[PDB]
Amino acid sequence: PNAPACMERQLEAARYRSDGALLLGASSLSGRCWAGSLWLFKDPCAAPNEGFCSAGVQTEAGVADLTWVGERGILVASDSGAVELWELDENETLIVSKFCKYEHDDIVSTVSVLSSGTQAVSGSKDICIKVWDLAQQVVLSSYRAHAAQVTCVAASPHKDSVFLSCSEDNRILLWDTRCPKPASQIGGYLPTSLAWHPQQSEVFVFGDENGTVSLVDTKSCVLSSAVHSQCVTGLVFSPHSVPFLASLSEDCSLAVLDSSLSELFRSQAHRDFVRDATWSPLNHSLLTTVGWDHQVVHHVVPT
Amino acid sequence: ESQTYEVFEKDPIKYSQYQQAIYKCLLDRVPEEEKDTNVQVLMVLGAGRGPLVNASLRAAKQADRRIKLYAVEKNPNAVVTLENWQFEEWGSQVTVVSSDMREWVAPEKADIIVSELLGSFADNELSPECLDGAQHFLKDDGVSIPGEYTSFLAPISSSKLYNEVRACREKDRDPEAQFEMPYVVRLHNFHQLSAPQPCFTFSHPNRDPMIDNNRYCTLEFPVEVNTVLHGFAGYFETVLYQDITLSIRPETHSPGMFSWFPILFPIKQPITVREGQTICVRFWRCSNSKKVWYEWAVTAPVCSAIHNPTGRSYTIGL
Amino acid sequence: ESQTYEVFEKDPIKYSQYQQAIYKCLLDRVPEEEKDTNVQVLMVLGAGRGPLVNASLRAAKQADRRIKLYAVEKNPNAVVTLENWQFEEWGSQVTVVSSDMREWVAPEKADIIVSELLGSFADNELSPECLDGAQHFLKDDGVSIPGEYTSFLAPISSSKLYNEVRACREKDRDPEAQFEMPYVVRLHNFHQLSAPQPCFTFSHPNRDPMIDNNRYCTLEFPVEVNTVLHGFAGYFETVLYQDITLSIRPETHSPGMFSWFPILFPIKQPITVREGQTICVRFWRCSNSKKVWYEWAVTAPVCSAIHNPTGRSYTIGL
Amino acid sequence: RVSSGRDLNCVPEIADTLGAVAKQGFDFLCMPVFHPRFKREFIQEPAKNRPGPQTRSDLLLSGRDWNTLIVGKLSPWIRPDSKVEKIRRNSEAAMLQELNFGAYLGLPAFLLPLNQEDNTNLARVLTNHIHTGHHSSMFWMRVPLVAPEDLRDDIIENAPTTHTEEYSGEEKTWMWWHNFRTLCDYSKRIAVALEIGADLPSNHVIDRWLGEPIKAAILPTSIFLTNKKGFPVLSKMHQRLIFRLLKLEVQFIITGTNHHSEKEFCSYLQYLEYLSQNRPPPNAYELFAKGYEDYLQSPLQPLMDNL
Ligand SMILES: N=C(N)Nc1ncc(CN2C(=O)c3ccccc3[C@H]2C(=O)NCc2ccc(F)cc2)s1
Numbered sequence A: 001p002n003a004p005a006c007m008e009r010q011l012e013a014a015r016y017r018s019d020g021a022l023l024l025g026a027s028s029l030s031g032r033c034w035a036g037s038l039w040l041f042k043d044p045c046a047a048p049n050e051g052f053c054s055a056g057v058q059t060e061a062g063v064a065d066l067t068w069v070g071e072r073g074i075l076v077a078s079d080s081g082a083v084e085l086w087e088l089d090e091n092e093t094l095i096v097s098k099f100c101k102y103e104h105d106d107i108v109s110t111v112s113v114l115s116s117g118t119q120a121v122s123g124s125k126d127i128c129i130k131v132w133d134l135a136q137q138v139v140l141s142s143y144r145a146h147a148a149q150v151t152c153v154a155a156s157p158h159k160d161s162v163f164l165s166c167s168e169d170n171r172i173l174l175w176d177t178r179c180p181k182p183a184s185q186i187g188g189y190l191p192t193s194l195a196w197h198p199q200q201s202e203v204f205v206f207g208d209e210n211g212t213v214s215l216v217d218t219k220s221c222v223l224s225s226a227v228h229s230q231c232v233t234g235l236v237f238s239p240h241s242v243p244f245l246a247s248l249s250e251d252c253s254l255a256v257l258d259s260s261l262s263e264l265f266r267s268q269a270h271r272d273f274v275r276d277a278t279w280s281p282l283n284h285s286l287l288t289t290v291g292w293d294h295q296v297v298h299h300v301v302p303t
Numbered sequence B, C: 001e002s003q004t005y006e007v008f009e010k011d012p013i014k015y016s017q018y019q020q021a022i023y024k025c026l027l028d029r030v031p032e033e034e035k036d037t038n039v040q041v042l043m044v045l046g047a048g049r050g051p052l053v054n055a056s057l058r059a060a061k062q063a064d065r066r067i068k069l070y071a072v073e074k075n076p077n078a079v080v081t082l083e084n085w086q087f088e089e090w091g092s093q094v095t096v097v098s099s100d101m102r103e104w105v106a107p108e109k110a111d112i113i114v115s116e117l118l119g120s121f122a123d124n125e126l127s128p129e130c131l132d133g134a135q136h137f138l139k140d141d142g143v144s145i146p147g148e149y150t151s152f153l154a155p156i157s158s159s160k161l162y163n164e165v166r167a168c169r170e171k172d173r174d175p176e177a178q179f180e181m182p183y184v185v186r187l188h189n190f191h192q193l194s195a196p197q198p199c200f201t202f203s204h205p206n207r208d209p210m211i212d213n214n215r216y217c218t219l220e221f222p223v224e225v226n227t228v229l230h231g232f233a234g235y236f237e238t239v240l241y242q243d244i245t246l247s248i249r250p251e252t253h254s255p256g257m258f259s260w261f262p263i264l265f266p267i268k269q270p271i272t273v274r275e276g277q278t279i280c281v282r283f284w285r286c287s288n289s290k291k292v293w294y295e296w297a298v299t300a301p302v303c304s305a306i307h308n309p310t311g312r313s314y315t316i317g318l
Numbered sequence D: 001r002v003s004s005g006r007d008l009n010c011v012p013e014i015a016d017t018l019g020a021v022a023k024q025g026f027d028f029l030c031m032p033v034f035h036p037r038f039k040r041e042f043i044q045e046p047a048k049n050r051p052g053p054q055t056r057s058d059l060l061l062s063g064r065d066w067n068t069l070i071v072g073k074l075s076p077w078i079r080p081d082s083k084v085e086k087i088r089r090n091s092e093a094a095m096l097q098e099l100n101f102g103a104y105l106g107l108p109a110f111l112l113p114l115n116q117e118d119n120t121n122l123a124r125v126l127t128n129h130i131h132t133g134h135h136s137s138m139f140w141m142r143v144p145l146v147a148p149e150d151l152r153d154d155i156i157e158n159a160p161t162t163h164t165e166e167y168s169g170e171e172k173t174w175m176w177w178h179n180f181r182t183l184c185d186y187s188k189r190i191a192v193a194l195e196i197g198a199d200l201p202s203n204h205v206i207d208r209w210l211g212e213p214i215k216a217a218i219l220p221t222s223i224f225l226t227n228k229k230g231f232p233v234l235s236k237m238h239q240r241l242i243f244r245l246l247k248l249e250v251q252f253i254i255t256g257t258n259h260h261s262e263k264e265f266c267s268y269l270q271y272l273e274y275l276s277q278n279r280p281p282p283n284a285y286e287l288f289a290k291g292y293e294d295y296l297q298s299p300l301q302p303l304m305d306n307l
């Protein structure tokens, strides 16, 4: 289908867009060639079959993290040290490379698009955090705030200048580019994943390496719960008015939590590391997970 | 290491004999009328980087018979090579197993087991113990390749080699530890005092109740010259199947093959030997639950000390 | 040896605690209404010359409950004593088993298992590994005596003991091997620099999935005097059942008992320690399929070398 | 003239990568043996029973290539001194695995990081590996002149950078090394790969590393200034350091992406060559002495012996 013959084993990311087309990033973390790829599925249930895909393309290096840039654009965090942007064509069959800027000196692990949609922030193992402009295709600012590998960065949903970041130095920095000193350290176990609350601009949740999922207000006093037995890889809120939090981990499980971090759902479907989750925008009760076991499981969340 | 497997693979004569050995066994077990009905279950026990696996494929193709391959290998570094080969080349016909053959719980019994667990003294790699442990998942009418192997000994005189061993004294161990351990060596400046005689033999599959791999052999070597005994050169022969064999015994040495060099069992003190006298050597194969080792002693024309008692100087790890 | 078991048996305080420990457990498991209906299956794992067997008989009589005894013992020399006792005294109530507990295939599951596999550092006899291997033939609601044990460490200053260890240098081994191995010793001319702290703990039956007996402990000892660190004194506590315990920790030392002396973990070089500074020691429990061993290193106030890496100087045989 | 290599943490095709690196004029390549992000479980099911190959095949390069041109790197996720017991145990098994594979390939050197104070368990595992087998592979400990914490940008509002002169505190990265090599008991297989920062520390901090086994000197691309022509150069401060390092005869490694995108990547190396040629040449003393650097010989006794 005008795409690579075969995709890689380790599925790293999975995102839905407005209409409900399932994006897929995948990396080869084993074997001869260590490269990555990007795929599109207008049929979610056809995944991860290469013969039944709308779009697909082979990247130079592995895909660490990606996210939607609206509808067409796809921003990538590459192992090469480049932040890559790809854009779907008008037919939405091909995926042409927009830019590919080698700026990070080490693997780009995390990336997130800001409110405006013309900017994005990336995090790398080189310890830097860079602010990009997607129009001019240049780095606006470069910040060596952390003292270790930057694990996760998360743009504030409704604020362009604000974003979170967390690192192995055991810091959770809340940023604000308007200030002279933008970073602000929020006061045991290392932070791994971040997730802003959708309906509240002052709230966020973070998962640690020990498996504890926490609930933090920017003002104050925190709530938490021991969800997973291992590192929390990612946290994604549902599109509901009263949102449910889906938590993934390296313990090969999925858990859907309520407002007070109480366990609603449990799914030991995956046999390998659960890497990403994405709620179906059409049907809010559906949730699609992807893992290194090369499954694309669709869960029916009891709502 | 990688380059240790590399040099093993750089001997085409050995594997051609393995290829031919399996080839013949396939034709014997599977008739012409049951060509595409019967699929033989082969199991390479100690696959390494998979020369025997390749050979087993070639053997099946020239024979034109169906085979199902396993590739058991305990070394996890080699398993990486096997799986990369398996993914690219072999496919689902070869099932790479990353385990010890003594431990591995088989999901299927084998018609043939193929192994390459032999050293310069045949059984100094503990091929007996390994294949005994892997004997359960062989069929009751199953074949082993090799099916048999024997070790040979011959007394030598080498004031060079004696003086070489002598210089292997190391700090922080017995002053005469070096004399109580075998060495792999291309014997060159030496004198073979008598013709090689068989020492230890092993047959697989072993059917003897309470299979004991401990042994005690007495050999008498008629010497026809004055000389000074400095040690015993060790060789081996192995029957792969029937008439297909490998050997490093000088008189029946496989031509071209350069896989195994001879082994040397030194002695602490040189022993005078007059023409007409007989050199009498004794060799034990000893073991416990942890180790296997050899002991040896000369008894004629004069007595030597028993070498390597309780494997104090040299053991082979199980 | 016989006289090694003799001196073990010459401590009545230990076995009285074992007697009391079993006594209590019998009353808990078996109620009054099921006095002569239920017969508890006891299994002494490591019976020796059978003091625990005797104690188990006494405990059953004072409790007035029915018991069925096994007496597992691997040492065949001791088994001779057990069987002579069993024939003359005990009878068919005690079933003497001459086997390793890790191997022995049980014909019946036990309600209680009793063991005496503890040393001066608790787990330096590999009580964890043995009781883990004997865990299968325990009932799902079965008890172990002891149920728990912990080891303690405390830094000491002894220019005597340091100089004593120093003089244990032997021919044909590492010049500093003596410093990389523990010693059982009645500590007398020494100075305990800080209060003992717990190092390693073990609970039986172990229910933790994939039971790993490897450990890594960091301890920080607040020192309040100038001194010179020469080693670490080792003690242990063990919970037999509930409130019944044995201990050689000075502050909670069982009164009268003289079964275990303290253990000593030396260091190659003495370390200066100023008043106010903290001695920071690290202790590993390491193992493979053959051996178990300890490693240790001081990290504050100055670093020492890691002692006994890969059990080069000292191992405990499985 | 100068021996130099290339540090990469991304290799999509091992054969192609070398070709590029070799064409640029580098002698060896520092690269991962397992994919940096390929995190592996060893205890908990079902992730421990992950199928398929764990990494690349050794066949992709020749034995001689592995032995002379490749330098291994410990994966970044391997943290043997983690507070979490699970991550510790996993990192132990993973570290052993990678080191063992390094020995299997027969690599001449292998990089392990010193990026924090407590590297005790790291040392304990490495020491165990050293005392297993008879490999002679070197181990280069990646340790910075200035700790990451001490060179971070002062851009955190409620956590300003230490503006105080801490004489002992500025020598912390040496104490990291000192403790590690003491624990390992001065193994001759363990050496230093000194990573040079953008801002060099005080002079005493640099003098600290005199008489230490420095085999490598890692140079990020970010520390390079740009001249009027528009090509990479270094400061007069860094020039004096490189001049000192050339006397020790260390192997300069280049790490990081090409910030000078206009020019080739050779330019960096060419500058080190430029420096190599532009030094004070060896006098009669240093000409003849070249060979006997730190070579122990017994004092002559012309009285007792006959010369
Ligand atoms: N082949 C298996 N499965 N097992 C085996 N066990 C033992 C084997 C035989 N050898 C050794 O015991 C040995 C020890 C050190 C060095 C080399 C060897 C090896 C050996 O004798 N090789 C001969 C050789 C050496 C160098 C050379 F350029 C060409 C040929 S083969």
Ligand SMILES: N=C(N)Nc1ncc(CN2C(=O)c3ccccc3[C@H]2C(=O)NCc2ccc(F)cc2)s1
Pocket: C008, C116, C117, C118, C119, C120, C125, C184, C258, C259, C260, C261, C262
């Ligand atoms: N009791 C089990 N089942 N196991 C055990 N493992 C270890 C144990 C403790 N001991 C030793 O490790 C040891 C070593 C050498 C000599 C003696 C001992 C013994 C010990 O410390 N005994 C004290 C003692 C010594 C002499 C004396 F006249 C009176 C009391 S007890």
Ligand SMILES: CSC[C@H]1O[C@@H](n2cnc3c(N)ncnc32)[C@H](O)[C@@H]1O
Pocket: B008, B045, B046, B047, B048, B049, B072, B073, B074, B075, B078, B099, B100, B101, B102, B116, B117, B130
């Ligand atoms: C090709 S050299 C022999 C091979 O057999 C392997 N081997 C030896 N003993 C065993 C065993 N018990 N189980 C599995 N592989 C083994 C060795 O690791 C080596 O790669």
Ligand SMILES: CSC[C@H]1O[C@@H](n2cnc3c(N)ncnc32)[C@H](O)[C@@H]1O
Pocket: C008, C045, C046, C047, C048, C049, C072, C073, C074, C075, C078, C099, C100, C101, C102, C116, C117, C130
């Ligand atoms: C009374 S001292 C402890 C006793 O336990 C025995 N013992 C130790 N380990 C085992 C084992 N694995 N199986 C059986 N007996 C054991 C020892 O031989 C000793 O007599």
